[PDB]
Symmetry: D2
Subunit: 161 residues, 4 copies
């Protein structure tokens, strides 16, 4: 069941907007940049960031989709700044899988990672470059990220089964 | 003599814009917020942030100005979120004085600090909540912050003498 | 009611030992340093630190006791690196009162901050230089630090009515 | 030219000792922990950390060696806390290669990374869990790590043409 809300629609909107500005700032423009969404909600987050960047800089950013699932759609990559987008950073194992998939498709100038929430408990020396919000959790708790495009609403909560 | 430019006009713009978004985000809105610029350059930086915030939230924010030297433009304080604004965070000593002044005027809910650049070398346990850019410097180097309103251009550089 | 135990005697012991090494490391030896314990329990932590450092460096370190009650023990301050020692870093207002109290005694070369736990919720631009453990908490939760010298046991827990 | 010495023998000594306590501290001991050094100097730093951890816990930590050139030696992996050890963390591409190598030999409980120096300029979403010293650098500077076992002396410096 749901224990508590840690991000409402407004907090998610402001977080994603501030991230877009962070991406633009740390790359001095989105030139050579590419957003690649993971799983399902990461893709929707990626598309939102692309629109925000486009809205801010006037330049559009390519959005690609990556389907990990196993290994535990095409796009630029080569000599590009590949920014992975995902909803929650946990153990970090998915990112590793995602990185292999990126360099299996080319050689990027670099790979970055943007997540809506970092809930800690990393099991790999991996960190997000951009973070919507750091949400302290116990190892057993569950982070549920709901996005309007798939869940009907924007909300991040902590659950416990 | 100018040793190196660490922030050009565009970098300063993207930093101040991102900071404005960080400010609204952590405060979940502008309500109760008060920007207090510190003598000279910190004042202009507070004005620029106040404008960016207004542009973002559709509502303006109270902007006061603090002359730390004079302490040896009034504004709200009590139960307010006072965001001190300065150009460079250095030893941190100047910030303590700024805190004493703010609380001389009232009892704020919180005091925050935003600086364009944090050049390290603190001599007190004070850290900025918002930082335009962290600029490592030696103990002998000088940080020169130029703002268009006073120096004709927006630029941050490292000087040696 | 006790909601959780976040540090047992072994964790506390290992955090304190590691901090002693961090203190020596960041100051390139303990020459000119002074450990000033705050309130009540910060005094014991400072004593344990002084003892650990002594056994590591083979050189003793001055220990003072500061009561910050008035700001909310004849020890060296001026020209010294005053390392404040407290049990918990919360809003940081205790630190501001402590910095004021230290400035009424002398002119330190610099002031640092070491705490056993940082539970977040800062209301001032203050951060510890050394932290035993970051214990995320809700605003309504209480951090209880028990030390053998005063409570019969070493333990840090989270309480809430 | 050697334009700056960032770590001398004593600093390295105190940094490694501090790292050992941190490692033990975050793992609540070393039970199930394995140290794995890469390239050449990482191996030496791993042996040292291993030596330091023995004097603290009274038990040896397995030490493995990893040759990465073929990615761009025994030790248990599965269910173990594998601690990668390298001298410098730069782009982080070596670490990604090192990780693939680790999970090629098994399924560890977690993989952590310890490095003597972090010089920034990450090109992958990788971070070290234990850092001897963060040394800011320009893109054209080079980090040279000298260890007595191979270079006759312990020293970290910044070089530039």
């Amino acid at each position: 069941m749901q224990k508590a809300v840690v991000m409402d629609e407004q907090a998610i909107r402001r977080a994603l907007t501030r991230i877009a500005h962070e991406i633009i700032e740390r790359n001095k423009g989105i030139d050579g940049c590419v957003l690649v969404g993971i799983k399902t909600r990461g893709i929707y987050l990626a598309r939102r960031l692309a629109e925000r960047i486009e809205q801010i800089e006037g330049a559009s950013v390519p959005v690609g989709e990556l389907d990990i699932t196993l290994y535990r759609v095409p796009f630029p990559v080569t000599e590009r700044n590949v920014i992975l987008v995902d909803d929650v950073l946990f153990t970090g194992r998915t990112v590793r899988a995602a990185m292999d998939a990126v360099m299996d498709l080319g050689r990027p100038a670099r790979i970055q990672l943007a997540v809506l929430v970092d809930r800690g408990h990393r099991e790999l020396p991996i960190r997000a470059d951009f973070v919507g919000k750091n949400v302290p959790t116990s190892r057993s708790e569950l982070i549920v990220v709901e996005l309007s495009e798939v869940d009907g609403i924007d909300q991040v909560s902590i659950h416990e089964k």
